[PDB]
Amino acid sequence: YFRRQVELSTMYRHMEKHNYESAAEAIQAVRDNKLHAFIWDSAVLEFEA
Amino acid sequence: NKKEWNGMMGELLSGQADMIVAPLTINNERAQYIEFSKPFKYQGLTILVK
Amino acid sequence: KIVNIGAVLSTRKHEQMFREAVNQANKRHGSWKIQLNATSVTHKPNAIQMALSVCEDLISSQVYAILVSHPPTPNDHFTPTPVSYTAGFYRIPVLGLTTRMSIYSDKSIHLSFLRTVPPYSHQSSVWFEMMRVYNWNHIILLVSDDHEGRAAQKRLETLLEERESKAEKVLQFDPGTKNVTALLMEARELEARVIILSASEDDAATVYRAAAMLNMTGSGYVWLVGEREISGNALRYAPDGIIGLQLINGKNESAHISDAVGVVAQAVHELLEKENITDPPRGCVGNTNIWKTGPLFKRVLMSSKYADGVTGRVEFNEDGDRKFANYSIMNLQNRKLVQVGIYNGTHVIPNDRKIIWPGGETEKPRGYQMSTRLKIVTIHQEPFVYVKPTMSDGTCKEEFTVNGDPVKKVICTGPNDTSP
Amino acid sequence: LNIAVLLGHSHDVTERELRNLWGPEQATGLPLDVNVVALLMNRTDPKSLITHVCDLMSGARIHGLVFGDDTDQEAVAQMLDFISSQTFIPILGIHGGASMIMADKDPTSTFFQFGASIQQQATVMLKIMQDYDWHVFSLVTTIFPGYRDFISFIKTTVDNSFVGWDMQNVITLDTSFEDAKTQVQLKKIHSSVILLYCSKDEAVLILSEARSLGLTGYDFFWIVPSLVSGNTELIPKEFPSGLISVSYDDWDYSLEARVRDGLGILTTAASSMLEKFSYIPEAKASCYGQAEKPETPLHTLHQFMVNVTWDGKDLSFTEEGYQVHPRLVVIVLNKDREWEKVGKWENQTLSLRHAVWPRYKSFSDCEPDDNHLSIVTLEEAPFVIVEDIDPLTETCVRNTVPCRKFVKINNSTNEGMNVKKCCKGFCIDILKKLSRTVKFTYDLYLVTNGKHGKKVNNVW
Amino acid sequence: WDMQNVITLDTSFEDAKTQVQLKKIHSSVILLYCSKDEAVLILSEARSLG
Ligand SMILES: *[C@@H]1O[C@H](CO)[C@@H](O[C@@H]2O[C@H](CO)[C@@H](O)[C@H](O)[C@H]2NC(C)=O)[C@H](O)[C@H]1NC(C)=O
Ligand SMILES: *[C@@H]1O[C@H](CO)[C@@H](O[C@@H]2O[C@H](CO)[C@@H](O)[C@H](O)[C@H]2NC(C)=O)[C@H](O)[C@H]1NC(C)=O
Ligand SMILES: *[C@@H]1O[C@H](CO)[C@@H](O[C@@H]2O[C@H](CO)[C@@H](O)[C@H](O)[C@H]2NC(C)=O)[C@H](O)[C@H]1NC(C)=O
Ligand SMILES: *[C@@H]1O[C@H](CO)[C@@H](O)[C@H](O)[C@H]1NC(C)=O
Ligand SMILES: *[C@@H]1O[C@H](CO)[C@@H](O)[C@H](O)[C@H]1NC(C)=O
Ligand SMILES: *[C@@H]1O[C@H](CO)[C@@H](O)[C@H](O)[C@H]1NC(C)=O
Ligand SMILES: *[C@@H]1O[C@H](CO)[C@@H](O)[C@H](O)[C@H]1NC(C)=O
Ligand SMILES: *[C@@H]1O[C@H](CO)[C@@H](O)[C@H](O)[C@H]1NC(C)=O
Ligand SMILES: *[C@@H]1O[C@H](CO)[C@@H](O)[C@H](O)[C@H]1NC(C)=O
Ligand SMILES: *[C@@H]1O[C@H](CO)[C@@H](O)[C@H](O)[C@H]1NC(C)=O
Ligand SMILES: *[C@@H]1O[C@H](CO)[C@@H](O)[C@H](O)[C@H]1NC(C)=O
Ligand SMILES: *[C@@H]1O[C@H](CO)[C@@H](O)[C@H](O)[C@H]1NC(C)=O
């Protein structure tokens, strides 16, 4: 979805170097402040909040 | 010498499974190859921070 | 003035018939000063020296018509290739009349070849018409020979474009093998029962043995074969109720050649209306100057529409084949050949006979055996797929919700880990 | 072993260099009794072909057969295919109608052409378009055969493409042109690059129709294969001067070097089969007096020399027998009515002489054309954003436009390479919306004289 | 309005330079000014041009 949106290439080029296999990797990383943001559906994120 | 899929789509298109029942992302690319169903969940995208 | 006409292996009931067709071609075609001159040769089983003898006899003859007249040949090669390939040096049109391989229809290769015995791709067209009769979507394909089989698969994918349907399974392999049972099991695991068979006679006998020993002729199964599978040892080993196809007056020879010679004669006498008439040179001893009106004479032969004859309306298509031929639909009723249908090129008509199937009733087998147990795959989603190890052995913890409701768990087979 | 090279030709080539072609060659000669026979012929009728094939097979059982041709009859090679169906002998084709590409061989045939398949030619043409990134194009085919494979390979190539080509749908010709249905089929093409697959007799009618439709413009490009582009000298007058074609007919590598390479591959297969099996000479006894029950061998070089290594060139073969990596030449028609050589094709990748693509803008005489623009700019960050090409895709990101930068070696030199580089920014978007509105063509590059502009003693 | 350049003919259909003017139209609506004797030839050419 970001690869088609070429006007959002730069963030894509910022995010291509840190991609994670599973979402729980990103969850454990953002809980221990190894990240700063994540792009996800609203209902699941509010559920986990 | 071919762009190919993997994961759930790689195991579905190979016929290893029968039907994906999962939070599968409806987009333009996947429906060019397979069919979809009508969605049970409507939701957008947002940012999780600390 | 004089036109030579070449025939190869005119049979002993056709050695007079060929000269009779030469005489009838000069009968009603006007008082013009053109004459004809018949040249008939007979093979010996080496195609090299016979290709040489035929090609220099045609160079010394300077023919305008080249024919193929070999039904009673037990040689399994069935290659009239080198005479057509020699005539392609001058683009001289060769009218085959016996073979049914689509590999002869390669106009990239066979530059100057036409024939009136259309191949098994048209049997696939008949099969698509039968699909439109029975309103079927999922079919099972099985072809051994690869040269005709790629053409058959391509023709079938061209046929499926109308509904935008797709074949359920593709099967292409080495002909002659005796170990195909794994692909038959993977076809059995599929939903449909539509069997499409296009192979050699030994391969058809092999799959008949692998079918009859493995219950594949019972109820629900849909058998559908052609003409190679109803001949020879495949005809010996065929189970009953099987449905094949047959060319009406295809293997018939004398009236076939008579209608072909009438087509050639009226096409030539139409071509003599046009000017710039070239002639084949003496290409035996060093004459490589190609014949000028090759594609012109071929293009005159392409749109040669006819309705007179014994078989009836004969006309060449974009493949240069018999438009809208007659077809028989044969059944093996208790090891006996019973015709159960007829096919004009646009519709199917069943006869007064009953369609007896290898399984149960005479109705169409609704062979779409549904997947009653669906193999469901999913990914580990945290709010959606909660995953627990087994408590003691294959058991869970039967918990309730906050409102008194047991959470309906399931025995999954999830990934043990995510590391490769 | 007994290896013969025959040439039925008219081009004046002597024979003694072909006798020298074995002596210093094959320095690591693992087969001992290798005997070469070089023969030159004049007329290419099939009688002499069959006769001398039987003479050479009776001539001490020759296993290596190499033939090239100067004439343009492809079916002769097909004739050799029938010879390849009978002699059970691996035969190499070199040049001309012996080297023209056929569709599908036989398992009974062992003849090997030296050329490129139509899929490989399509790969080279789409590699040209990939190197030029002209995304808006169309496919035009006829009922000339070998066409559904062509269209299908193009469809699978676009579906497996790095670019994501915005390909307009395929318009196919059906009959001889009525100029009523066919004209409506041709009016749907407002693109700039047209791919044409037809015969040479059909191409004259098609380009005459496009000239009558005005579809032979300076913006309208034409890339045709070697199958339609025939003789290099015989060119009809109805072709645009700038007609892009690709053919492996090279003259920097002549016929003698290529038959030397074929002899190297033959001796390589012979030495490797000698390392595998002892009794190498296995052929047919005689043509005349042929009794039946042929002793079909199982020690052949047909499915044995699939790969080969010679002179650093990976000259491996495909499943049908075609070369994996041949040597293709990209040419165009010049204003001097000759097929001007432009570039060469590598093993897989592609390199051209003119990096900046020349137009040959006077494709005919009735072309008053002045709608190209030469545009220069300087790097200013909120307007001009200059980056390298993406090395992963060898393609700029599609929102950007390419330019060239005359990057020099040093201060003492005066030569520079025009490095094609990606550009976005504000004025790039201005230029794109102008080219959508004013509907012009343009050429973007950078200033290498220096800064914006300043009068230095009445010199700007 | 969006107007293509006005096509003016010389004589009846020549198949040399008249169709050069005719084939430049990829639009839909065309008005015509001729005589009834010229109209048959113009509509026959437009049928032949499709
Ligand atoms: C067609 O004309 C040829 C002569 O050009 C005839 O063929 C000859 O027939 C006689 C008698 O059988 C033979 O002795 C010659 O050897 C033949 N010459 C050949 C092969 O050209 C032939 O009779 C004519 N057509 C018929 C009636 O078959
Ligand atoms: C044909 O191929 C199959 C393998 O596909 C082999 O036979 C079967 O092999 C499976 C294991 O793959 C066994 O479970 C079966 O018991 C075998 N069946 C029989 C009867 O052999 C073997 O290579 C060939 N055998 C046939 C004719 O099925
Ligand atoms: C094949 O062709 C025809 C028609 O099927 C049949 O034989 C001819 O039959 C017609 C009447 O339909 C007669 O006028 C002819 O005299 C018959 N010819 C001969 C020689 O039998 C028969 O079915 C087959 N005959 C062959 C082998 O040609
Ligand atoms: C199917 O074949 C198997 C082979 O073991 C045989 O046991 C069985 O009887 C057959 N099916 C039926 C229902 O007859
Ligand atoms: C044959 O073609 C040539 C081409 O110039 C022509 O001059 C000649 O009149 C043609 N022959 C006839 C009788 O049409
Ligand atoms: C099937 O046979 C009839 C016999 O007259 C023949 O006209 C035609 O080839 C086929 N069907 C029709 C009537 O078109
Ligand atoms: C065959 O005959 C005619 C054409 O002659 C055709 O209209 C008709 O539909 C066909 N009928 C059959 C037997 O399918
Ligand atoms: C052409 O070759 C033949 C042998 O095939 C030979 O007899 C003849 O003299 C040659 N003609 C010339 C001189 O080119
Ligand atoms: C060609 O491929 C084979 C494997 O099929 C390999 O063993 C061989 O080294 C390769 N090259 C040569 C030297 O033939
Ligand atoms: C092609 O040739 C080059 C130069 O010899 C070589 O480095 C490369 O490995 C070869 N492979 C490709 C890219 O086809
Ligand atoms: C020449 O050399 C360096 C490196 O090639 C180059 O960057 C520069 O343009 C020149 N430097 C000077 C001013 O000598
Ligand atoms: C570089 O070239 C310029 C002239 O373009 C000159 O003024 C300058 O002195 C040169 N620098 C060096 C490397 O001497």
- Nearest partner of D22 among D7, D41, D47, D5, judged by Cα: D5
Of D307, D316, D324, the residue with max ligand 9 atoms within 8 A of its CB, to mutate for a pocket test, comes to D307
Cβ contact, residue pair D183, E23, below 8 Å: yes
Q: How far apart are CA C333 and CA C225, in angstroms?
A: 15
Do the beta carbons of residue B8 and residue C379 sit within 8 Å? yes
Q: How far apart are CA D158 and CA D156, in angstroms?
A: 6
Q: How far apart are CA B19 and CA B12, in angstroms?
A: 7
In chain C the first and final C-alpha atoms are separated, in Å, by 83
Q: How far apart are CA D15 and CA D13, in angstroms?
A: 7
C8, β-bridge pairs = C41
Q: How far apart are CA A1 and CA A14, in angstroms?
A: 15
Q: State in Å: Cα D348 to ligand 10 middle.
A: 7
B23 assigned binding-site residue: yes
Give the total residue count for chain A: 49
A41, β-bridge pairs = B45
Q: State in Å: Cα A48 to ligand 10 middle.
A: 52
- Report how many Cβ contacts below 8 Å link chain C to chain D: 77
Query: Crossing angle, helix D46-58 and helix C47-61, to 10 degrees?
Result: 150
Q: Which residues of C touch B8 (CB under 8 A)?
A: 377-379
In chain D the first and final C-alpha atoms are separated, in Å, by 74
**How many other CB atoms sit within 10 Å of the CB of residue C338?**
13
Helix (H), strand (E) at residue D419: strand D416-424
Q: Characterize the bridge pairing of strands D329-333 and D244-247.
A: antiparallel
Q: How far apart are CA C221 and CA C361, in angstroms?
A: 12
E strands, D213-276, where?
A: 221-224, 244-247
E13: phi then psi, degrees, rounded to nearest 5: -65, 130
Q: Which pairs with CB-CB distance under 8 Å and at least 24 residues apart come from B24-31?
A: B27/A1
User: Cβ contacts of residue D108 below 8 Å, gap of 6+?
Assistant: D84, D85
Q: Characterize the bridge pairing of strands B45-48 and A38-41.
A: antiparallel
3-class secondary structure, C123: helix
Indicate if ligand 3 lies below 6 Å from the C-beta of C255.
yes
Q: Which residue has the tokens 């947002």?
A: B46
Indicate if ligand 5 lies below 6 Å from the C-beta of C276.
yes
C330: phi then psi, degrees, rounded to nearest 5: -100, 150
**What is the DSSP annotation of E15-37?**
SSSHHHHHTT---S-------HH
Angle, CA B18 vertex, CA B14 and CA B22 arms, to 5°:
100
3-class secondary structure, C96: strand
**Quick one: tokens of C332?**
């093996």
Q: Which residues of B touch C381 (CB under 8 A)?
A: 22-23
Q: State in Å: Cα D387 to ligand 10 middle.
A: 27
**How many other CB atoms sit within 10 Å of the CB of residue C206?**
22
**What is the DSSP annotation of D141-199?**
E-SSSS-HHHHHHHHHHHHT-SS---BPPPEE--SS--SSHHHHHHHT---SEEEEE--
Indicate if ligand 2 lies below 6 Å from the C-beta of C179.
yes
Q: How far apart are CA D82 and CA C82, in angstroms?
A: 7
Q: Characterize the bridge pairing of strands D111-112 and D171-172.
A: unpaired
Q: Using alpha carbons only, how large is chain D's radius of gyration in Å?
A: 27
- Nearest partner of D229 among D194, D192, D196, D189, judged by Cα: D196
Do the beta carbons of residue C4 and residue C269 sit within 8 Å? no
Helix (H), strand (E) at residue A46: helix A42-48
User: Cβ contacts of residue D291 below 8 Å, gap of 6+?
Assistant: none
D386, β-bridge pairs = D423
Q: How far apart are CA B27 and CA B23, in angstroms?
A: 12
C121: phi then psi, degrees, rounded to nearest 5: -65, -35
Do the beta carbons of residue D425 and residue D203 sit within 8 Å? no
Q: Which residues of D touch C52 (CB under 8 A)?
A: 47, 50
Q: Which residue has the tokens 């050429």?
A: D443
**Quick one: tokens of B6?**
């993997």
Q: How far apart are CA D108 and CA D99, in angstroms?
A: 19
Our measurement of the distance from residue C167's CA atom to the centroid of its chain's CA atoms, rounded to an integer in Å, reads 17
* D110 residue type, one letter: T
Ligand nearest to the CA of C323: 6
Distinct helix (H) and strand (E) counts, chain E: 2, 0
E11, β-bridge pairs = none
E strands, C200-317, where?
A: 222-224, 243-247
User: Cβ contacts of residue C212 below 8 Å, gap of 6+?
Assistant: C237, C239
- Which chain C residue has its CA at the smallest distance from A21's CA? C418
Q: How far apart are CA D41 and CA D39, in angstroms?
A: 7
- Nearest partner of C221 among C373, C364, C370, C371, judged by Cα: C364
Phi-psi domain of D242 (left: phi exceeds 0; alpha: psi -120 through 50; beta: other): left
Of E20, E26, E48, the CB nearest to D179: E48
Q: Which chains contact B through at least 3 pairs of Cβ atoms less than 8 Å apart? A: A, C, D
Q: How far apart are CA D378 and CA D385, in angstroms?
A: 10
Angle, CA C9 vertex, CA C5 and CA C15 arms, to 5°:
70
Q: Which atom of ligand 2 is nearest to the CA of C210?
A: 27
* A11 residue type, one letter: M
**How many other CB atoms sit within 10 Å of the CB of residue D92?**
25
> Could you give the C-alpha distances from D119 to C148, D105, D138, D157, in angstroms and in order?
20, 16, 17, 10
Indicate if ligand 11 lies below 6 Å from the C-beta of D457.
no
Q: How far apart are CA D220 and CA D214, in angstroms?
A: 10
Q: Which atom of ligand 9 is nearest to the CA of D307?
A: 1
Q: Which residues of D touch C55 (CB under 8 A)?
A: 46-47
Do the beta carbons of residue C106 and residue D145 sit within 8 Å? yes
Q: What is the largest CA-CA distance in chain B?
A: 43
Angle, CA D238 vertex, CA D236 and CA D240 arms, to 5°:
105
Q: How far apart are CA C277 and CA C173, in angstroms?
A: 48
**Please, how many CA atoms are within 13 Å of residue D325, restricted to the half-sphere of its CB?**
16
Q: Using alpha carbons only, how large is chain E's radius of gyration in Å?
A: 11
D79: phi then psi, degrees, rounded to nearest 5: -60, -45
- Enter the DSSP assignment of B32: G
Question: Is D329 exposed, middle or buried (CB count within 10 Å of its CB: 0-12, 13-18, 19+)?
Answer: buried
Question: Is C188 exposed, middle or buried (CB count within 10 Å of its CB: 0-12, 13-18, 19+)?
Answer: middle
3-class secondary structure, D312: coil
Q: Which residue has the tokens 């399994």?
A: C76
Phi-psi domain of C164 (left: phi exceeds 0; alpha: psi -120 through 50; beta: other): left
Helix (H), strand (E) at residue C338: strand C337-344
SS (H, E, C) C172-225: ECCCCCCCCHHHHHHHHCCCCCEEEEECCHHHHHHHHHHHHCCCCCCCCCEEEC
Q: Which residue has the tokens 């699941």?
A: A44
Helix (H), strand (E) at residue D203: helix D200-212
Do the beta carbons of residue C50 and residue C44 sit within 8 Å? yes
Helix (H), strand (E) at residue C148: helix C147-159
**Quick one: tokens of C118?**
């259309």
> Could you give the C-alpha distances from C334 to C110, C241, C356, in angstroms and in order?
42, 8, 10
Q: How far apart are CA C157 and CA C162, in angstroms?
A: 10
User: Cβ contacts of residue D222 below 8 Å, gap of 6+?
Assistant: D194, D196, D207, D240, D242, D243, D244
Helix (H), strand (E) at residue D6: strand D2-8
- Nearest partner of C258 among C1, C3, C30, C13, judged by Cα: C13
- Enter the DSSP assignment of D67: E
- Enter the DSSP assignment of C168: S
- Nearest partner of C123 among C103, C150, C152, C95, judged by Cα: C152
User: Cβ contacts of residue D178 below 8 Å, gap of 6+?
Assistant: E48, E50
Q: How far apart are CA A9 and CA A26, in angstroms?
A: 21
Q: Using alpha carbons only, how large is chain B's radius of gyration in Å?
A: 14
Q: How far apart are CA C235 and CA C218, in angstroms?
A: 19
Do the beta carbons of residue D190 and residue D206 sit within 8 Å? no
What is the strand order of the sheet C222-224 is part of?
Answer: C140-143, C194-198, C222-224
What is the strand order of the sheet C2-8 is part of?
Answer: C35-41, C2-8, C65-67, C94-96, C113-115
3-class secondary structure, D137: strand
- Nearest partner of D203 among D171, D227, D183, judged by Cα: D227
**Quick one: tokens of B3?**
């762009």
Interface probe for B, chosen from A41, A44, A46, A47 (most Cβ of B below 10 Å), is A41
3-class secondary structure, C264: helix
- Nearest partner of D272 among D311, D309, D297, D317, judged by Cα: D309
Q: Characterize the bridge pairing of strands C243-247 and C222-224.
A: unpaired
D275, β-bridge pairs = none
Q: How far apart are CA C144 and CA C58, in angstroms?
A: 37
E strands, D184-261, where?
A: 193-197, 221-224, 244-247
Do the beta carbons of residue C363 and residue C338 sit within 8 Å? no
In chain E the first and final C-alpha atoms are separated, in Å, by 25
**Quick one: tokens of C188?**
């059995």
Virtual CA dihedral for D304, D306, D307, D309, nearest 10 degrees? 70
Virtual CA dihedral for D441, D446, D448, D454, nearest 10 degrees? 90
E5: phi then psi, degrees, rounded to nearest 5: -60, 140
Q: How far apart are CA C88 and CA C114, in angstroms?
A: 12
- Which chain C residue has its CA at the smallest distance from A41's CA? C383
**Quick one: tokens of D294?**
């042929």
**Quick one: tokens of C180?**
């195909």
| Burial profile D42-72: b = 16 or more Cβ within 10 angstroms, e = fewer | ebbbbbbbbebbbebbeeebbbbbbbbbbbe
Q: How far apart are CA C272 and CA C277, in angstroms?
A: 8
Do the beta carbons of residue D135 and residue D168 sit within 8 Å? no
C327, β-bridge pairs = C247, C343
**What is the DSSP annotation of D326-387?**
---EEEEE-TTSSEEEEEEE-SSSEEES-SSPP----SSSS-------EEEE---TTT-EEE
Virtual CA dihedral for D27, D31, D34, D40, nearest 10 degrees? -70
Q: What is the largest CA-CA distance in chain C?
A: 107
Q: Which pairs with CB-CB distance under 8 Å and at least 24 residues apart come from D247-255?
A: D247/D328, D247/D329, D247/D331, D248/D115, D248/D116, D248/D326, D248/D327, D248/D328, D248/D329, D249/D329, D250/D327, D250/D329, D250/D344, D252/D344, D253/D327, D255/D13, D255/D68, D255/D94, D255/D95
**How many other CB atoms sit within 10 Å of the CB of residue C345?**
16
